[PDB]
Design a protein around this ligand. Structure first.
Ligand SMILES: OC[C@@H]1O[C@H](O)[C@@H](O)[C@H]1O
Ligand SMILES: OC[C@@H]1O[C@H](O)[C@@H](O)[C@H]1O
Ligand SMILES: OC[C@@H]1O[C@H](O)[C@@H](O)[C@H]1O
Ligand SMILES: OC[C@@H]1O[C@H](O)[C@@H](O)[C@H]1O
Ligand SMILES: [Mg+2]
Ligand SMILES: [Mg+2]
Ligand SMILES: [Mg+2]
Ligand SMILES: [Mg+2]
Ligand SMILES: [Mg+2]
Ligand SMILES: [Mg+2]
Ligand SMILES: [Mg+2]
Ligand SMILES: [Mg+2]
Lengths: 388, 388, 388, 388
């Protein structure tokens, strides 16, 4: 009946989302720039919990140390005036031309060292503002051609970079953790660590893996045609879902950054179901772009719809799981047996169990239907509010 | 000039590849079944090194222990007569109806225990035949709908299954290692561990991770639109490329299993370049299907073309890397600098280096071109044999 | 409140849909075959209007003329007993091995002539049973390799085949029309006439184009990543939507044939909105497969869900369009102006209109927002039943 | 041995290709702007035949009639100095913010009239410069959401626009033809007329269809996963290939605009084979972007590689078709029979031919292999220059 967000729902937005001016690779900006202070005030009025930023969203590139203290001071006063928080920050290592072949894995060694110094400068600012997560999206780490990048040497350089950042925050005593954001392509023809799985595997080779997790994005995994709730489950299973970027995507094409709930609606339902039933307690961060067709009233409408659709889906997924008819269908489909160990009795007792092989009636087991279609139609009816 | 394979090139084929009868989801078989003994003899004549099998390719399902010893004896005599080896084996946990919801992660616990016993029985046979790698492709582990599979519980069951198989081979003293083969979809709507990255990350949570690697397949990663040479580089970087399945795929669609070299030809070039320059020494295994348009002469022609195209690409990639003009272009594109540590001087010296930030001339660095297009055209000229 | 289908909703199902035994390219059948008579009775009980068939679903291949009259007689008695109709029929030119390189565009001329005779025999039966539409899905017309098929010669053969079928029905005086069903791939690597657009363009070169339309399928166009409601609008605009196949598909991958409403739910909403507002009056035909996880109770559950989801979406799209708040938002987004001619005043008056160029204020026009995000959130709220 | 282009090879380039400054949706320009006069001179030195332009590439938007005559005069003097021609021109209806919801199908009627006047002004200039083809790429005609665009009304507006342009060139007596360029998405979420087929079908509903053809682009059709040589064959079959845009694309993702020959190399081979064997005589136009990693030496290297790869592939496809071994394999695969009419004897003689049905031996026909794998390996050997 009521889908009004409050700061306790932990909804957050990047400054670059509502602040996107509408420039795309075929067209000029359609909106004027927004002052960060205005975005903070506007988002607070809509019920958001907080904002996030890249260094260059908040402090224009090439700013003097004095212009920098001014930009931060103004920002901090808007945070104090509104009660908004800053739970995550990140570095822009993709817009300036010096990063055209990457930041941490640029072929030029001087660019790699510059990228690390630009990053470290912003981790200190993030800690000052109270961020608990520092995201890294290596949007330019990759290649358009095969010979341009030796990927084993580039992974050595990427490991070296994250290892030095871990050393830095530990030597400084900071309580901040890192989250790597995978994306398969765009703007490079192929990007390194293209999916949540490749990022998870990479983290296990860092020197201090407990400091690093993932920041998956809905549309990124869908650009590889993957099931985003399945990848989030794997990240939760590994203990590494540190943050999450929510938006919508219609399939395998350029990154559309639609508002959350747009794109694949059923996948959004199953995602909310999983985050709420696993008790994910981090921010619900929207990394989206209001389409360039819109004026500023459409920007705020689009941001409000992100939060509204999360809260509708949350109510429908909770109704689904609480429905005794669904709980019976889950048992009929043997979800309860999936959660039981296959062989708590141990290897030797499995080997000696004739009911597991010699005397197993495979034709009788094969004839049992799984009853998944009736379960899925109950899930559809709940999503559409069609229960009777 | 000569592209004739010999058993030293380590080319291997599954019995199910040349033995595929042509049944697809819309049509009946177009070829008669082949006897395994005939395939071994035919493949040996073409210059192959060895063959691989699923348990049910070699021993028809529901065979008595006596019919089983007969099937194996005949097979072993063809191996002895030809000099062919058996470097890898695997289990069929996908064809029989009992596996319709999976083997290791089936919701029904009795099916999960049966899948493990069927697997263990075939590991013993594989060891008897001298296989060094045991592959697992969980083709039915997955779902068509969101509520049918809790993925955290399914990963617990998958970990449990691989952990028990590791216990078994260690308690038996066997020198065989496991390779997990990822695939993103087909025949399930989404398959668990869909890419090389998700498999690599999963392995790091097994109790004895050193026993497990990956068996990536060209067409599988391309069904997610990913760069297969990049994923192989990541697997090599992690020390986990235990085996590899070679074939061709035209993009994101059903798994075509074309012969190797078909599909994305430039990706095949960069793959061969990487395997030969990293010194991969395992089998070059072809997991492909001769199209159902072909008769048996076209089957053998298709198998021969797999090996021929590998050896042409091997010669062109070696000519590329040996060309002094290419070696100069690699330096011009700073591939030599990519291989140097970013900061061997350490964190504190990076922080105190003004040339890395305060005094870094970003506009001069940004203006340097990377010269990647001339390098890539040298690579194209070498691939096409157009050097002058 | 009520989503119970009746025969007036015109829901139809192919015999091969609920009758699919579950054989996929990696696994054996999981269900027994269904007798056509049982499917007709079962579907009638669920509220369906009618059934469709391929020749070989109803009469097993290689049946004697006498076994054939028997199969038809039994079928006709089930139709009479239930009131079910047969609005469409089609030919199987894809399952038997003789069709491995196609029916109408097979390279072998004798196969092409056989395909036409098999087709003509079944058009006569379809007319006898009262079908008004004859569908053609050229599932084997295509190629896996470039040199195997000269596509201009194959389109000449396809045109020749459809032209002879048009001559046949006109010389016989039959009132039946043809509908070509496009698909981009599977089971051939690329299929000719891969999308609704390529089929529409081809029809305009037939000798009697008024006899031919399209039979688009939801999942087929989504296998090319296309917007299915947009392609249906183009077909309606051309006067050629003769029939439609409804199902669900999760993106670009093998053809999943999920029940309608599954897959891309928002696209299903916009499709129903368009069919009901354009007054499409043909059958709502479901071409889907109950997943092979299911037993026969899950088959009927899946078929019922096809109809249920159509009727829920129909009610939500009608509520959307009738909502005065939506009608105001449509005007705010200038959908009313889109429907007005750009230049009913004619070319010369446009050329002399200074307000159209010399004096057009482009900056003022560019600043107007289109208000599409608020319209789309109204559409989301209606779909989810969240209006307040 | 020699792959040096000359103006007789008819290679052409858009000003916006080599002139692309490197701005992408995540980053700033990496190259300075090029003066059109410099590009003409540079391209002439490389062996190009001519250049193409959008109105706004040549005359900056908002130019006075006097600044406009100056820009044209300078350009014309570079054309005269170099011998370069201008065979095609087009309109930019996508960059300025006023076109954010489209040009010809914008919801706002005043924008639609402005788009037509901007177009007509540039057709006159194109004719003055001697262009024979006028291209239209409706990059902003489309939508991100379902309710924003009624597609039947938008196709009425698109037809109205092209019909008025046809009236204009006929009333002026101009000898120029139009070519519509389809693209499936980007920058709109879905673009109207998304593929060559949808454009071909649309043209048949214009009032003077003989004035309109298509301008297909390699990467555009591959963004829908379609076979570009098959779509070009259909366009040639319909008599509508008026122009062609050549580039490379790695699969279904954002439009990469790689140089021709990059991306799918085998598809480039089959495309060149078809254009040269069908005797396409229009321009070979490159619509590509040198990657933003490159400096100006890499721009010219990338442009040269476009032409080089066309000429290598042309030589390999001509060697393929001329090889007597290939000509025998084409007969073995019955390509000669594909080109023969199925039933030149007519419908009645087909119906009375018992050898076409009653007495057709389907099992003997089904057993004949098509020999396509050996043909395809001959095509691979020719492409790689590996014939022996
Ligand atoms: O606009 C780029 C986004 O912002 C952050 O860098 C990351 O979340 C990216 O997806
Ligand atoms: O035909 C299935 C293949 O064989 C093995 O199970 C694995 O390599 C799969 O890709
Ligand atoms: O199972 C194949 C389907 O049945 C008809 O041949 C056509 O609608 C195809 O999509
Ligand atoms: O950069 C856009 C291209 O230029 C022309 O407008 C058309 O060919 C598009 O593909
Ligand atoms: Mg994104
Ligand atoms: Mg993000
Ligand atoms: Mg495969
Ligand atoms: Mg494999
Ligand atoms: Mg289908
Ligand atoms: Mg269909
Ligand atoms: Mg393009
Ligand atoms: Mg173009």
């Amino acid at each position: 009946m009521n889908y009004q967000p409050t700061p306790e729902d932990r909804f957050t937005f990047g400054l670059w989302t509502v602040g996107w001016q509408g420039r795309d690779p075929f067209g000029d900006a359609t909106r004027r720039a927004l002052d960060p202070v205005e975005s903070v005030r506007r988002l607070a009025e809509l019920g958001a919990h907080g904002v996030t930023f890249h260094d260059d969203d908040l402090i224009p590139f090439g700013s003097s140390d004095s212009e920098r203290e001014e930009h931060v001071k103004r920002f901090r006063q808007a945070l104090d005036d509104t009660g908004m928080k800053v739970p995550m920050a990140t570095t822009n290592l993709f817009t300036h031309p010096v990063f055209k072949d990457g930041g941490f894995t640029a072929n030029d060694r001087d660019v790699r060292r510059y990228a690390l110094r630009k990053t470290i400068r912003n981790i200190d600012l993030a800690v000052e503002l109270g961020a608990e997560t520092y995201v890294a999206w290596g949007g330019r780490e990759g290649a358009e051609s095969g010979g341009a990048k030796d990927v084993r040497d580039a992974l050595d350089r990427m490991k070296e970079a994250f290892d030095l950042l871990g050393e830095y925050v530990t030597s400084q005593g900071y309580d901040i953790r890192f989250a790597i954001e995978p994306k398969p392509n765009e703007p490079r023809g192929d990007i390194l660590l293209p999916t949540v799985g490749h990022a998870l595997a990479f983290i296990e080779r860092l020197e201090r893996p407990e400091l690093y997790g993932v920041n998956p994005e809905v549309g990124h995994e869908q650009m590889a045609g993957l099931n985003f709730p399945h990848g989030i489950a794997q990240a939760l299973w590994a203990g590494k879902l540190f943050h999450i970027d929510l938006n919508g995507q219609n399939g395998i094409k350029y990154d559309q950054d639609l508002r959350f709930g747009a794109g694949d609606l059923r996948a959004a339902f199953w995602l909310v179901d999983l985050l709420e039933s696993a008790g994910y307690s981090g921010p619900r961060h929207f990394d989206f772009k209001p389409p360039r067709t819109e004026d500023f009233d459409g920007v705020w409408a689009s941001a409000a719809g992100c939060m509204r659709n999360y809260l509708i889906l949350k109510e429908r997924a909770a109704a689904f799981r609480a429905d005794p008819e669904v709980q019976e269908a889950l048992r009929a489909s043997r979800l309860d047996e999936l959660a039981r160990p296959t062989a708590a009795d141990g290897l030797q007792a499995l080997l000696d169990d004739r009911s597991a092989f010699e005397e197993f009636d495979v034709d009788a087991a094969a004839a049992r239907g799984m009853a998944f279609e009736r379960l899925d139609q109950l899930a559809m009816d709940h999503l559409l509010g069609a229960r009777g």
